[PDB]
C-alpha cells in the first residue's frame, strides 16, 4: 500500500543531535518518550497530500562503534546529516560524514539534507552562511532546528522525503 | 486507628501526601514525580519496602540530589522524635505505676524501627554498590563514617556495626562451578609459540572462547556511573565512561582486524579461506551467546570494504551464507530478532552494548527533569526509574561467569591486537577500501591474480570440541 | 519470559544471603553481613522454559521480626532455610511457614524446604527429622551447601516448578 522511507540520522555524538527524531515522533504536545517501545521510531505523515511511512533510523549515543557506520548507513534511503550550530568541530565532520554515505551507497547522488540543530543557548559559532555556502556545494537542502520549540523538525524530515521522491 | 506522627513543623518527613508534592502512576504504588523530600519518604517508607527503589533511586538520585545534600536528608529522615506520653500513661505514673506507654510501643515498633532499618538498607546499598560517590569525595566518607558510628540503642545495633565493618572493608578494596571448563584447543600455533598467532593459526574454537572471555570481562566491568547522565557522550567522557569506552574499542579493533585480515589476503582462494574462518568464528560466538562478537564480525561483512567483493562471497559454502546472513537478521529493523533471542537464551551472554546507549540516552533526552504541577516544580522520578530499568537489565547479565578456562598467551594476543597501527582512523579505513579496489576492482575493470601468501595449510579444523581422556 | 517472585526467609545466619550470591553470581561470600533487604534477578532456562526469577533476600535477626507481612503478601514462592548445623533455626522453620500461610490465607503456598551448610560435617538435625516436616508441609527437602554449590540450582529450581504447576 503506502510508500515506506528508510531513513538515517547521522552526526556527532554529545550535542543533541537526538533532539530531532524524538521532537518528530513524539507526542508532539507531551514532552515525552520511551525508546524501548516498538515502533517508537515508525511514524505516518502526509507530504504534499501523499501520505507514507516514516522508519528513522538513530543511532545516536553509538558514536564510539564506528566500524557499525557502514552497516547502519546502508539501511537507509536518504540521509540527515546534523551538526549543532555551537559546536564547530560538529559542522567540520559533515564532509566525511557524506563522503562515506556515498560509498556505503555507491552513489554520487544520495538523498539527503544538511540540518544544523540549536541544542541550548550557548553562542552559536555556525553562522547559517557558512551552512548553506556548505549545503549548496553539495546540491543539497540546508534546514535549521531548534532542539526545544519543534522548530524546523517537520521541515527537515519532509524535504529530506520530497529529495527522496525528486531523485 | 493509624498511628498519629510527630508534628511537621519539627520533622519535615510527615508532611501530608497531596498532589503538590507527589504524584503517584495510575500492591505498592509507583511515584510518577514528587519533591525529593517525599521521594525519600517514600524510599524509606513505614508499610513496605519496593525493593527495587533503592537501586533506582541509588543508582539515578544525583541527576537531582548532590550526595552531601542526599546524606543529610538520611540522617533527617532517620532522627524520628518519640511522641509524649498520653492521657492513660499520665494517669499511671501520677498513681506511681509503671505506664503501659501502648502507644509509644507501638510507634517504636511500626514506624521508628522500619524507617530507621530502611535508612540504614540505604546506607548500605550505598557503600556497597554505589561507593564511587565516597571514592570521589573523602568528606562525604567520613560524614557517613560518623553518622553510622554513632548510631546507639540495641534495635539497630547488629546493621550499624555490620555497615561500620563493611565501609571498611570497602576501603581497602573467587568463581565457583560443578563442571569443568573444556579442554583447550590448539590447531597450527603451538601452546607457548606466540609468535606464530594469526587468524587462521589458532584454533576457530579457541579464538572465539578467548574473545568471548575477553568480552565478557570488559562487559561485566561497565558501572552504572559510566552510564547515567550520558556521560559517555559528553566532553569529559574518558573520565567517566573508561570502562564503557575501553570495551567498545575492543569491538572496533577486532571489527577492523577481521576486516583487515580480509583485505590483505589478495589471493582469491585464500581470502575465501579467511572468510570462512571467521564465519566459522561466528559460529562459536553464537554457540556461546557472546552477541556482542556475533555483531562484531557482522559488523566486519557489512563494512564497505568487505560488502562489495563478490567474488569472494560467491565461493562461500552455502551453509556458511546462511549463518551469517541469519545472523545479519539479528539487527535488522531495529534489532527485533536479536532482542528476542537475548531474552529466551540460558546465560551466560555477552550483550551489544549499542542498544542500551540509545534506549538510555533517548530515554534522558526525551523526558523533562521535572513536572510542574500547582505551581510546585516535581522531580520526574518516571524517567529516572526508566533509566534504572535499562541500568538493571544490563547489570543482571553482569553476573554469570563463563565456565571456559583462560589461555594467557591468547588473551595477550587479542589485547595487543592493533590493526589501525599509528594511523588516524580516516587514513586507515581508506587504505582498506583502497586494498578492496585492488583486490576486486570495480567492473568492468577485469579481476587480477594475485600471489598466496600463507605457506601453512589453509584447511579448517573446524568448530566442533574435541576430548581426550 | 514468565516472571517468578521467590522469596527466601529463615533464622539469621544459615546462609539465606550465602545460597543466594552463589546462584546469582557462582561467589560464595564468606562474610556474615546481616540482610536488610536485598533483590536480585536472573534470567535461566529451566525446564525448556526462559524465565526471569525476581529473589528477596530478607532479614532473619529478630530485630527486623516485625517488618514480614509487606514481603509475604507479595511473594509468590518461599525458600525456607535453616542450617543442619542448628537446631534452633529448625524450630524456627515452622513459625515461618505458619505466618506465610496466615499472611497469604492460604494452606497452598509453594514452598521449599532447605537444609543448608550440608558441607559441613558437625550435623545436628537429622535428615529424616527435616524430610518428615517436609512431608507434613507437602513439601519437598533439598539440602544446600553455599559454599560447594551442592543442591542450589535444585532447591531454587524446584521452587519455580512448584510456581508453575501451582
Ligand atoms: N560452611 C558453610 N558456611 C556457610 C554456608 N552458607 C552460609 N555460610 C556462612 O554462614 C554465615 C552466614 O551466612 P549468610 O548468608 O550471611 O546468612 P543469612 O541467613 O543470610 N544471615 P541474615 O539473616 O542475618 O541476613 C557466613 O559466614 C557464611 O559464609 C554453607 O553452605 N556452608
Ligand atoms: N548482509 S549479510 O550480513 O547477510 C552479508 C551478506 C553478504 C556479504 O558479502 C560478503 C560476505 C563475505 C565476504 C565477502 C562479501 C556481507 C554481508
Ligand atoms: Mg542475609
Ligand atoms: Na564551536
Known amino acids: ?71 547502519y548507513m546502508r539501511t537507509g534511503e536518504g540521509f540527515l546529516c546534523v551538526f549543532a550550530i555551537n ?9 566525511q560524514y557524506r563522503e562515506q554515505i556515498k560509498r556505503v551507497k555507491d552513489s554520487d547522488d544520495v538523498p539527503m539534507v544538511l540540518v544544523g540543530n540549536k541544542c541550548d543557548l550557548a553562542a552559536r559559532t555556525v553562522e547559517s552562511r557558512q551552512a548553506q555556502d556548505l549545503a549548496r556545494s553539495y546540491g543539497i537542502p540546508y534546514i535549521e532546528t531548534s532542539a526545544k520549540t519543534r522548530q524546523g523538525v517537520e521541515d527537515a524530515f519532509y524535504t529530506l522525503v520530497r529529495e527522496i521522491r525528486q531523485h | 486507628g493509624q498511628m498519629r506522627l510527630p508534628s511537621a513543623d519539627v520533622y519535615r518527613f510527615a508532611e501530608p501526601d497531596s498532589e503538590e508534592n507527589i504524584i503517584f502512576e495510575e500492591g505498592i504504588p509507583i511515584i510518577k514525580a514528587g519533591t525529593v523530600i517525599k521521594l525519600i519518604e517514600r524510599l524509606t517508607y513505614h508499610m513496605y519496602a519496593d525493593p527495587n527503589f533503592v537501586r533506582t533511586f541509588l543508582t539515578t538520585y544525583r541527576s537531582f540530589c548532590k550526595p552531601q545534600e542526599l546524606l543529610s536528608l538520611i540522617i533527617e529522615r532517620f532522627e524520628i522524635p518519640e511522641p509524649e506520653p498520653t492521657e492513660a500513661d499520665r494517669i499511671a505514673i501520677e498513681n506511681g505505676d509503671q505506664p503501659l506507654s501502648a502507644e509509644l510501643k507501638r510507634f517504636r515498633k511500626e514506624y521508628i524501627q522500619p524507617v530507621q532499618l530502611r535508612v540504614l538498607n540505604v546506607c548500605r546499598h550505598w557503600v556497597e554498590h554505589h561507593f564511587y560517590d565516597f571514592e570521589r569525595d573523602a568528606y562525604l566518607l567520613q560524614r557517613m563514617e560518623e553518622f553510622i558510628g554513632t548510631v546507639r540503642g540495641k ?37 607457548g609459540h606466540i609468535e606464530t ?87 562459536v560466538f553464537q554457540e556461546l551467546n557472546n552477541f556482542n562478537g556475533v555483531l562484531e564480525v557482522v559488523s566486519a561483512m557489512n563494512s564497505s570494504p568487505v560488502y562489495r567483493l563478490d567474488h569472494t562471497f560467491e565461493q562461500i559454502p552455502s551453509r556458511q551464507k546462511k549463518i551469517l546472513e541469519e545472523a545479519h537478521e539479528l539487527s535488522e529493523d531495529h534489532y527485533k530478532k536479536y532482542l528476542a ?22 530515554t534522558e533526552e526525551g523526558n523533562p527533569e521535572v513536572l510542574k504541577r500547582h505551581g510546585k516544580e516535581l522531580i520526574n522520578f518516571s524517567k529516572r526509574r526508566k533509566v534504572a530499568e535499562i541500568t538493571g537489565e544490563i547489570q543482571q547479565y553482569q553476573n554469570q561467569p563463563y565456565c571456559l578456562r583462560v589461555e594467557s598467551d591468547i588473551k595477550r594476543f587479542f589485547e595487543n591486537l592493533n590493526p589501525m597501527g599509528n594511523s588516524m582512523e580516516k587514513e586507515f579505513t581508506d587504505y582498506l577500501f583502497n586494498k578492496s579496489l585492488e583486490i576486486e576492482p570495480r567492473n568492468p575493470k577485469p579481476l587480477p591474480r594475485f600471489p598466496k601468501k600463507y605457506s601453512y595449510p589453509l584447511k579448517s579444523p573446524g568448530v566442533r570440541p574435541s576430548n581426550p581422556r
Not at chain 1, 87 to 95: A, C, G, P, R
Not at chain 2, 341 to 362: A, E, W
Request: charged share 25%; proline share 4%; hydrophobic share 40%.
Open chain 2, 197 to 283: 598467532f594469526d587468524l587462521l593459526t589458532l584454533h576457530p574454537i579457541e579464538i572465539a572462547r578467548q574473545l568471548t572471555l575477553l568480552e565478557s570481562d570488559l562487559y561485566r566491568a561497565v558501572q552504572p556511573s559510566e552510564l547515567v547522565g550520558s556521560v559517555w557522550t559528553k566532553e569529559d567522557k574518558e573520565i567517566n565512561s573508561p570502562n564503557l569506552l575501553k570495551m567498545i574499542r575492543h569491538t572496533t579493533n577486532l571489527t577492523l582486524w577481521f576486516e583487515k585480515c580480509i583485505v590483505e589476503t589478495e589471493n582469491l582462494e585464500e581470502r575465501v579461506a579467511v572468510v570462512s574462518r571467521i564465519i566459522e568464528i561466528l559460529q
Open chain 1, 87 to 95: 559546536n564547530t568541530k560538529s559542522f567540520e565532520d559533515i564532509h
Open chain 2, 341 to 362: 533471542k537475548l531474552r529466551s537464551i540460558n546465560p551466560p551472554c555477552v550483550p551489544f552494548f549499542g542498544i542500551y546507549l540509545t534506549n538510555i540516552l533517548k
Open chain 1, 1 to 71: 500500500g503506502m510508500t515506506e522511507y528508510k531513513l538515517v540520522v547521522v552526526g556527532a555524538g554529545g550535542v543533541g543531535k537526538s533532539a530531532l527524531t524524538i521532537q518528530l515522533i513524539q507526542n508532539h504536545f507531551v514532552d515525552e518518550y520511551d525508546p524501548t517501545i516498538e515502533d517508537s521510531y515508525r511514524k505516518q505523515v502526509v507530504i504534499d497530500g501523499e501520505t507514507c511511512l516514516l522508519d528513522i533510523l538513530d543511532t545516536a549515543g553509538q558514536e564510539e562503534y564506528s566500524a557499525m557506520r557502514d552497516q
Open chain 2, 155 to 191: 534495635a539497630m545495633k547488629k546493621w550499624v556495626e555490620s555497615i561500620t565493618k563493611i565501609i571498611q572493608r570497602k576501603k581497602i578494596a573467587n568463581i565457583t562451578f560443578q563442571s569443568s571448563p573444556p579442554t583447550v584447543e590448539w590447531h597450527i600455533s603451538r601452546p
